[PDB]
Amino acid sequence: RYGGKKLERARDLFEQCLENCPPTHAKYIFLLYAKLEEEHGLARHALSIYNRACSGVDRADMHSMYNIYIKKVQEMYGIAQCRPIFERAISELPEDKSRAMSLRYAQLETTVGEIDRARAIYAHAAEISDPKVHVKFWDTWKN
Amino acid sequence: QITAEQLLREAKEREPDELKEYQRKKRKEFEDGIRKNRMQLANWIKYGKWEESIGEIQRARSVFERALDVDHRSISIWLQYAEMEMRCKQINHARNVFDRAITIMPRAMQFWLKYSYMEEVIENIPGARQIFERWIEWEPPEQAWQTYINFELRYKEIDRARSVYQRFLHVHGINVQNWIKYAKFEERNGYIGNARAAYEKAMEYFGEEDINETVLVAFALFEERQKEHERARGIFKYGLDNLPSNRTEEIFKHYTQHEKKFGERVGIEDVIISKRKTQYEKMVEENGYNYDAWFDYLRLLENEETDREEVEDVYERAIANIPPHSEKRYWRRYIYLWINYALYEELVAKDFDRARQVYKACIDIIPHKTFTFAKVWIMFAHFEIRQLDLNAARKIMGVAIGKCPKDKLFRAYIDLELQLREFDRCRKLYEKFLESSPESSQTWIKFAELETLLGDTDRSRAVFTIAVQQPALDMPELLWKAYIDFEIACEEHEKARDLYETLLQRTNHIKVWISMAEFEQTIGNFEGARKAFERANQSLENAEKEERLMLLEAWKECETKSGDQEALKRVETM
Amino acid sequence: TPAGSVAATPFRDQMRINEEIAGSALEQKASLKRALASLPTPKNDFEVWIEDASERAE
Amino acid sequence: EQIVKIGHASDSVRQYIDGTATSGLLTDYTESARANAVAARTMRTPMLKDT
Ligand SMILES: O=P(O)(O)O[C@H]1[C@H](OP(=O)(O)O)[C@@H](OP(=O)(O)O)[C@H](OP(=O)(O)O)[C@@H](OP(=O)(O)O)[C@H]1OP(=O)(O)O
Numbered sequence: 027r028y029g030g031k032k033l034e035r036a037r038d039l040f041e042q043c044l045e046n047c048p049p050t051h052a053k054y055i056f057l058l059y060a061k062l063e064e065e066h067g068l069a070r071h072a073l074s075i076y077n078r079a080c081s082g083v084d085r086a087d088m089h090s091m092y093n094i095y096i097k098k099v100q101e102m103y104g105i106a107q108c109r110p111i112f113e114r115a116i117s118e119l120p121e122d123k124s125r126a127m128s129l130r131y132a133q134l135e136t137t138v139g140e141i142d143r144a145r146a147i148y149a150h151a152a153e154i155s156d157p158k159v160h161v162k163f164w165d166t167w168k169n
Numbered sequence: 170q171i172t173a174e175q176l177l178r179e180a181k182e183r184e185p186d187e188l189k190e191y192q193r194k195k196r197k198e199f200e201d202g203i204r205k206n207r208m209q210l211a212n213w214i215k216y217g218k219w220e221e222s223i224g225e226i227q228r229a230r231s232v233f234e235r236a237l238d239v240d241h242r243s244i245s246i247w248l249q250y251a252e253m254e255m256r257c258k259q260i261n262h263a264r265n266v267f268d269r270a271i272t273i274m275p276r277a278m279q280f281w282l283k284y285s286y287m288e289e290v291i292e293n294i295p296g297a298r299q300i301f302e303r304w305i306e307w308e309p310p311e312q313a314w315q316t317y318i319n320f321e322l323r324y325k326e327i328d329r330a331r332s333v334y335q336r337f338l339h340v341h342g343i344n345v346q347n348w349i350k351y352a353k354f355e356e357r358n359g360y361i362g363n364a365r366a367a368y369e370k371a372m373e374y375f376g377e378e379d380i381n382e383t384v385l386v387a388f389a390l391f392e393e394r395q396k397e398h399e400r401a402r403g404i405f406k407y408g409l410d411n412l413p414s415n416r417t418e419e420i421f422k423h424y425t426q427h428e429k430k431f432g433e434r435v436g437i438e439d440v441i442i443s444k445r446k447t448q449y450e451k452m453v454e455e456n457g458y459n460y461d462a463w464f465d466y467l468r469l470l471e472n473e474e475t476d477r478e479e480v481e482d483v484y485e486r487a488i489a490n491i492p493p494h495s496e497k498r499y500w501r502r503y504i505y506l507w508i509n510y511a512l513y514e515e516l517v518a519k520d521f522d523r524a525r526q527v528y529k530a531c532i533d534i535i536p537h538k539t540f541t542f543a544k545v546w547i548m549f550a551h552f553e554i555r556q557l558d559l560n561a562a563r564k565i566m567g568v569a570i571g572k573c574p575k576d577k578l579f580r581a582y583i584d585l586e587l588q589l590r591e592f593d594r595c596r597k598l599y600e601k602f603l604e605s606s607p608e609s610s611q612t613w614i615k616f617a618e619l620e621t622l623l624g625d626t627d628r629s630r631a632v633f634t635i636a637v638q639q640p641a642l643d644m645p646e647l648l649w650k651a652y653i654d655f656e657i658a659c660e661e662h663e664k665a666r667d668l669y670e671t672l673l674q675r676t677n678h679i680k681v682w683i684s685m686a687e688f689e690q691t692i693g694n695f696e697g698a699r700k701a702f703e704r705a706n707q708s709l710e711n712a713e714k715e716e717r718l719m720l721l722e723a724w725k726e727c728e729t730k731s732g733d734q735e736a737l738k739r740v741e742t743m
Numbered sequence: 744t745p746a747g748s749v750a751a752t753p754f755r756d757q758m759r760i761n762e763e764i765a766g767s768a769l770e771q772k773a774s775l776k777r778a779l780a781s782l783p784t785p786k787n788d789f790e791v792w793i794e795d796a797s798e799r800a801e
Numbered sequence: 802e803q804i805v806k807i808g809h810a811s812d813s814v815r816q817y818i819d820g821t822a823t824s825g826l827l828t829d830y831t832e833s834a835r836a837n838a839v840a841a842r843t844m845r846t847p848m849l850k851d852t
Contacts, residue, residue: 032438034441034442034445034469035437035438035441038425038441038444038445068461068464068465070461071461138749139746139747139748139749139842139844140746140747141744141746141844141846142744142746142846434796434797498802590790592786592788600779603775603779604772604775604776607772607775611814623786623788624787625783625785625786627783628782628783628786631781631782631783632782635775635778635779635781635782638778639775640761640762640763640764640765640771641756641761641763641765642756642760642761643755643756643814644755644756644757644758644814645756645758645760645761646757646758646760646826646827646828647814647818647826647827649760649826650818650820650823650824650826650827653823653826654820654823657823672760675759675760675762676758676759676760678758678759680825680826681758681825681826683825684822684823684824684825684826687822687825688822688823690822691821691822744846744847745844746844748838748841748842748844749804749838750804751834751837751838751841752804752808752834752837752838753804753807753808753811753834754811754830754834754837755811757828757830757833758826758828
């Protein structure tokens with residue numbers, strides 16, 4: 027009905043929604059709210075929604091909020107500013123996705139050239155990666 | 170493993186008158202356990218319980234009486250002594266036990282609960298009332314009065330339960346929730362005139378100077394739920410008018426619930442703006458350097474067309490948050506507070522003298538020696554081109570060159586002087602510009618471009634002649650590119666030929682030799698291209714064949730253009 | 744570790760054209776000044792949506 | 802920050818201009834920089850400074 031013409035009132039709806047929304051339903055509301063702030067709002071507001079989204083959405087889909095935040099920061103501030111939100115992810119999402127984030131993070135640091143940082147990503151992931159079954163991780167580190 | 174647990178521990182996982190005489194043995198056990206260890210109160214309960222189980226109620230009584238001589242403050246003994254009497258239907262004994270318990274330990278709720286409950290279950294409810302009344306005479310905790318209220322309500326004695334509340338607030342009135350619970354009770358029984366009076370008395374009790382938000386919110390939401398919406402709105406507005414905004418967050422959120430339903434658009438947006446202004450003002454006090462709170466707050470106040478003095482004042486508060494760093498990175502976001510302030514003062518307030526003071530105050534704040542923003546100097550220069558004061562704009566922009574030569578400052582000043590049609594001025598500025606960065610080959614092009622744009626074909630040749638003599642350009646190929654382009658475009662092809670070969674004295678790069686031959690192709694003097702290839706053949710014989718192959722096949726391209734069946738073998742035999 | 748090959752992306756003066764010799768900065772700048780003092784002077788130029796709750800209110 | 806400042810300037814002045822014959826003086830800098838970057842992509846930590 028209004029788009030951006032009532033945005034400060036629109037924010038109050040989304041905040042009033044998310045102030046009581048449970049974390050099983052909040053996934054769509056956060057992405058809808060970020061779309062508003064993306065197309066009409068200030069940039070750090072959209073990023074703050076994603077920063078909320080990757081902790082307010084339940085664990086079973088929290089990785090799907092982190093990679094949004096990764097993509098959107100990377101899309102505007104590049105891979106250098108992207109680093110700190112990988113380290114949040116690796117420390118927080120469950121171990122199967124924490125490996126996956128570690129492989130993706132090490133790929134960036136090698137494609138940049140921070141080879142010493144790349145090792146510490148692998149070496150930190152390697153303690154939660156049983157070589158008797160997770161053989162594809164140890165292959166990527168071996169390569 | 171071998172043994173350490175799953176054997177050595179596991180192997181040790183495992184390895185008539187005769188009734189009357191049993192009674193005598195049990196009392197021997199119990200009574201000597203007592204002699205051995207009084208204060209083991211569980212033995213006295215078991216012994217007293219056991220005499221009950223044998224039906225020896227009179228013995229059981231004396232045992233509990235002897236237990237109470239050892240510890241009269243044990244609530245367990247009084248309750249177990251009480252429960253055994255009422256198990257045995259000894260209601261007058263049980264009543265005497267409870268009267269003693271509540272007499273001796275009036276603060277132990279368990280006796281009052283169990284006693285009044287027993288007297289209720291036994292349907293002596295005026296006996297139960299007097300027990301609760303006697304309890305309330307000790308001014309007991311809040312939880313005690315609730316059980317008396319609940320007692321009266323379970324018999325639907327609403328006016329009785331009302332009287333307990335009115336006594337309850339004389340004792341525990343300090344807890345606002347007791348006051349709200351009463352008004353909920355009066356409301357839920359439909360005594361809405363009493364519920365309203367209860368909230369009004371609450372405000373009176375806690376004091377209409379030391380105003381309490383929880384009463385206001387509860388009272389306002391009550392009137393809302395009674396459809397007294399103009400009173401509900403009244404109570405919220407009175408709250409916001411009389412309380413500091415570090416409280417009132419509950420009053421606000423509920424007011425922007427009440428108004429957001431029961432209000433109307435002009436009211437709904439008014440309260441949300443006032444909420445947001447309060448919200449930004451808070452998160453500014455939390456940090457100050459939360460520039461995005463300022464940029465929102467300033468935008469909000471501008472968007473709502475708020476009065477100039479207040480928009481101007483908040484800008485001054487924004488501006489005081491100077492970054493604590495000498496590094497341009499932190500200023501890059503900050504500086505748009507200043508720019509927007511000037512834009513507001515020029516566009517919205519339309520007070521250009523004040524706008525000038527904004528721009529001036531930028532330049533007094535930026536360090537300039539460590540870094541500069543060309544943004545502010547360009548904007549302040551163009552602000553003085555507006556109002557038709559180029560004599561000020563030149564002074565502003567010339568000091569920018571003076572304090573801090575920077576490429577966008579030169580470019581923007583030159584562009585201004587071009588638009589003014591002041592060709593003498595920008596020529597002098599280019600000379601200063603090239604003196605400021607003589608390696609900036611791209612600017613040598615734009616200086617020579619100006620000379621060609623003015624049509625002074627002699628001026629431009631001299632610039633290029635000086636340019637190619639300057640060592641250590643950023644990228645000479647781009648200068649030679651422009652100069653050959655110019656030397657072609659003025660039809661001085663004999664000088665362009667001269668110019669091309671006087672490049673070749675400094676390079677034997679394969680693609681330059683290809684382009685030299687390709688130049689002769691575009692002249693239509695393909696004989697010049699041929700000996701360019703023959704020169705690139707019979708003088709670079711030390712060049713490796715895998716590099717030469719790119720140039721030998723460039724002549725092949727020239728001869729497939731030419732079609733000379735005899736020339737291809739000349740291309741082939743090299 | 745001497746990594747950081749992202750710094751290999753910027754470069755300048757790839758073609759061999761620069762003489763790779765220069766004066767001391769003051770006399771170098773003086774050479775530029777006194778050369779550009781030779782530039783000729785003369786010139787010529789001419790260069791001539793619907794809202795019904797509100798609708799029924801207003 | 803400095804690297805991207807130099808990079809954007811050097812990129813811009815290439816894509817600024819082409820030409821019909823004299824363009825062979827210019828390099829297609831950005832692609833040569835990519836070629837240089839993939840050549841420099843092989844790097845290793847040094848060994849034997851101690852043991
Ligand atoms: O001084 P230059 O080397 O010509 O570079 C400037 C300058 O960049 P820096 O001062 O940050 O090095 C400008 O910055 P300001 O002087 O205005 O602070 C910048 O403007 P932004 O900071 O807004 O990016 C502008 O970029 P643009 O051309 O996009 O306005 C860019 O100019 P060039 O791109 O012409 O070099």
